[PDB]
Design an enzyme around this catalytic site. Structure first.
Site, PDB file in Angstrom:
ATOM      1  N   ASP A   1       0.804  -1.195   0.000  1.00 21.92           N
ATOM      2  CA  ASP A   1       0.000   0.000   0.000  1.00 21.92           C
ATOM      3  C   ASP A   1       0.848   1.260   0.000  1.00 21.92           C
ATOM      4  OD1 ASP A   1      -3.290  -0.375   1.629  1.00 21.92           O
ATOM      5  OD2 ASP A   1      -2.594  -1.207  -0.225  1.00 21.92           O
TER       6      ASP A   1
ATOM      7  N   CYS B   1      -2.751   0.315 -13.296  1.00 23.66           N
ATOM      8  CA  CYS B   1      -2.607   0.225 -11.820  1.00 23.66           C
ATOM      9  C   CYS B   1      -3.591   1.173 -11.212  1.00 23.66           C
ATOM     10  CB  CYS B   1      -1.254   0.740 -11.385  1.00 23.66           C
ATOM     11  SG  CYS B   1      -1.540   1.306  -9.711  1.00 23.66           S
TER      12      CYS B   1
ATOM     13  N   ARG C   1       3.721   2.172 -11.118  1.00 17.55           N
ATOM     14  CA  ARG C   1       3.698   0.696 -11.237  1.00 17.55           C
ATOM     15  C   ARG C   1       3.741   0.229 -12.679  1.00 17.55           C
ATOM     16  NH1 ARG C   1      -0.652  -1.203  -6.510  1.00 17.55           N
ATOM     17  NH2 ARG C   1      -0.189   0.615  -5.114  1.00 17.55           N
ATOM     18  N   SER C   2       2.811   0.730 -13.486  1.00 18.32           N
ATOM     19  CA  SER C   2       2.661   0.285 -14.873  1.00 18.32           C
ATOM     20  C   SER C   2       3.957   0.606 -15.597  1.00 18.32           C
ATOM     21  CB  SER C   2       1.528   1.083 -15.520  1.00 18.32           C
ATOM     22  OG  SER C   2       0.277   0.626 -15.020  1.00 18.32           O
TER      23      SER C   2
ATOM     24  N   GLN D   1       6.736   7.485 -10.588  1.00 14.24           N
ATOM     25  CA  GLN D   1       6.166   8.645  -9.904  1.00 14.24           C
ATOM     26  C   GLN D   1       6.963   9.089  -8.674  1.00 14.24           C
ATOM     27  OE1 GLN D   1       2.486  10.215 -11.449  1.00 14.24           O
ATOM     28  NE2 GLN D   1       4.709  10.239 -11.947  1.00 14.24           N
TER      29      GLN D   1
END
Length: 280
Positions: free
Chosen positions: A180, A214, A220-221, A261
């Site tokens: 998370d 994502c 993530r992607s 990010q």
């Protein structure tokens, strides 16, 4: 290796600096179509907008817009569609895109609920006997099988274009253990997952581009695609040490914003590539 660079950045604690530098150098292109009033309800809040030049167009005359971009890596001969998690009102658009782009695989890098909040619509059926019909795009989607593992789930789905009765098998690769907060401690599970996706054929040239998504605004992607492309280039080049993740990242960033990010994600991407290259 880039491993030498990795340890040197780690030593000087310069992840933030290097990441900011990439951020500053990254491409800026218009997203006019994304910003049109008629498309407001097609964009997920806090997600990136697609550049006009690389956006995927739905084959429909009235509104061709979906928040999705085609990332085309010429040297690696890989393409990926990066898109947002489907909204309640865009699941039909999503599967329309999958159908039209001839994709074999969907890669989902988030859970439906994370940090106690819904991150995407439940856009695929959870039981074989309870298929979904997307009436707006005339598609039927049936869960065919589901294999739950410790770090990921793979599902076989059947997608039917109800207009023509043509049927296709789609593989849904769902990575279910991204934490998370922050990044995984070890890249091992993430690399194993990438290898499972590759072994399926979903990334291969005989199929349309894999569709990857994502959560809103949190990467993530980009890590998945960047890792896959770097490893491929290492296998293909006469000089694998010549593959520069920062250069690959900037090339990919020409096609969509918000790949990587945070500095931590940059660090994790280097770690996945280093460990994956050792394995391959």
């Amino acid at each position: 290796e880039m491993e030498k660079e990795f340890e040197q950045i780690d030593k000087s604690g310069s992840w933030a600096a290097i990441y900011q530098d990439i951020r500053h150098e990254a491409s800026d292109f218009p997203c006019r179509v994304a910003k049109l009033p008629k498309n407001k309800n097609r964009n997920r809040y806090r997600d990136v907008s697609p550049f006009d030049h690389s956006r995927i167009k739905l084959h429909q005359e009235d509104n061709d817009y979906i928040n999705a971009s085609l990332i085309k890596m010429e040297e690696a001969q890989r393409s990926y569609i990066l898109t947002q998690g489907p909204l309640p009102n865009t699941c039909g658009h999503f599967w329309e895109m999958v159908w039209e782009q001839k994709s074999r695989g969907v890669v989902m890098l988030n859970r439906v609920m994370e940090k106690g909040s819904l991150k995407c619509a439940q856009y695929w059926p959870q039981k074989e006997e309870k298929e979904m019909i997307f009436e707006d795009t005339n598609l039927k989607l049936t869960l065919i099988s589901e294999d739950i593992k410790s770090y990921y789930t793979v599902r076989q789905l059947e997608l039917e274009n109800l207009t023509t009765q043509e049927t296709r098998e789609i593989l849904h690769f769902h990575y279910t253990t991204w934490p998370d907060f922050g990044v995984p401690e070890s890249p091992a599970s993430f690399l194993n997952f990438l290898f499972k996706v590759r072994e399926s054929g979903s990334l291969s040239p005989e199929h349309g581009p894999v569709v990857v998504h994502c959560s809103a605004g949190i990467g993530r992607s980009g890590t998945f695609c960047l890792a896959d492309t770097c490893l491929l280039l290492m296998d293909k080049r006469k000089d694998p040490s010549s593959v520069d993740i920062k250069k690959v990242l900037l090339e990919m960033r020409k096609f969509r914003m918000g790949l990587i990010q945070t500095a931590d994600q940059l660090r994790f991407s280097y770690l996945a590539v280093i460990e994956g290259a050792k394995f391959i």
